[PDB]
Amino acid sequence: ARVTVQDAVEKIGNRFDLVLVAARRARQMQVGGKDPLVPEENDKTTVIALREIEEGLINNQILDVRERQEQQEQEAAELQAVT
């Protein structure tokens, strides 16, 4: 359900970091076991990542901010567990 990504590159810019962020998001869905926020109407990871880019929910900034938050919360949970 995606044939033109012009509205996606206009959202991200430079047409290059969009590929990297979409690849990271698709890897998060596929091997990372993440939950696709947008509805999944029988599609695989890459187009869910592209549509999430389109809707503006995910970009580079939100992605690494969420990654840092997950890292710090899991570190806190681990240190609580060992203590």
Partner 1 sequence: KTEEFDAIKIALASPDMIRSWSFGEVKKPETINYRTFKPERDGLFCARIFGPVKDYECLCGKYKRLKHRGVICEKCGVEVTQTKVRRERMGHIELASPTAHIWFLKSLPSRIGLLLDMPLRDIERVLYFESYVVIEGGMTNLERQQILTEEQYLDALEEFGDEFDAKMGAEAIQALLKSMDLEQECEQLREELNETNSETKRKKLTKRIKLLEAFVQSGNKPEWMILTVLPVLPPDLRPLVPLDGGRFATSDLNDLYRRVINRNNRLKRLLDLAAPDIIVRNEKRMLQEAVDALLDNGRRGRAITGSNKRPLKSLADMIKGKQGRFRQNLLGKRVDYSGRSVITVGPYLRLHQCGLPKKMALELFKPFIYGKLELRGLATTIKAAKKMVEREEAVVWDILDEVIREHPVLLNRAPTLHRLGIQAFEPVLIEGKAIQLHPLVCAAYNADFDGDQMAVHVPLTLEAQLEARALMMSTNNILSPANGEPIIVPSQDVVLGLYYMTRDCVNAKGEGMVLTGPKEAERLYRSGLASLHARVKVRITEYEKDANGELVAKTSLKDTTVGRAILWMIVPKGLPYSIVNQALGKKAISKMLNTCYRILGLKPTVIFADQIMYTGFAYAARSGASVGIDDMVIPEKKHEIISEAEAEVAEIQEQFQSGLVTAGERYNKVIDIWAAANDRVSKAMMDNLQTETVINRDGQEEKQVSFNSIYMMADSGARGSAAQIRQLAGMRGLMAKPDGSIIETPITANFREGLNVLQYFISTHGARKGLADTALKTANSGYLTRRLVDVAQDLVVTEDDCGTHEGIMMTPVIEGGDVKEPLRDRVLGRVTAEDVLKPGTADILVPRNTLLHEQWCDLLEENSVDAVKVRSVVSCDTDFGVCAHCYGRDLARGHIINKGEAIGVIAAQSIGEPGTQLTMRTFHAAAESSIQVKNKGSIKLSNVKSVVNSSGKLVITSRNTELKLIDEFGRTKESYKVPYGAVLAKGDGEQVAGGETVANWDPHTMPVITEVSGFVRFTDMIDGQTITRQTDELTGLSSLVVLDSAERTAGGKDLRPALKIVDAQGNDVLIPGTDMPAQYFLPGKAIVQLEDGVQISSGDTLARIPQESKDITGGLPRVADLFEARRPKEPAILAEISGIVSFGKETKGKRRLVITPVDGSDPYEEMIPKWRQLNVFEGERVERGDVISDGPEAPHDILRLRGVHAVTRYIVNEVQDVYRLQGVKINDKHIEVIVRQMLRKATIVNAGSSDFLEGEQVEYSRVKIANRELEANGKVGATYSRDLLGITKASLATESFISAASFQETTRVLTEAAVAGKRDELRGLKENVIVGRLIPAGTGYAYHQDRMRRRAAGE
Partner 2 sequence: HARSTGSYSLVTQQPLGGKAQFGGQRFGEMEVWALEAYGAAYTLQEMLTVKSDDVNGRTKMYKNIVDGNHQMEPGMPESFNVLLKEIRSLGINIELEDE
The contact set with partner 2 (CB under 8 A) reads 15-16, 19, 27, 30-31
CA atoms within 13 A on the CB side of 42: 0
| Identity of the amino acid at 5 | V
> In whole angstroms, how far apart are CA 13 and each of 7, 18, 58, 60?
10, 7, 14, 11
Rounded least distance, CB 74 to partner 1, Å: 24
Residue among 27 and 68 whose Cβ is closer to partner 2: 27
Amino acid at 52: E
Binding site for partner 1 (CB under 8 A): 2-7, 9, 14-20, 22-23, 26-27, 30, 42-47, 49-50
Nearer Cβ to partner 2 (30/43): 30
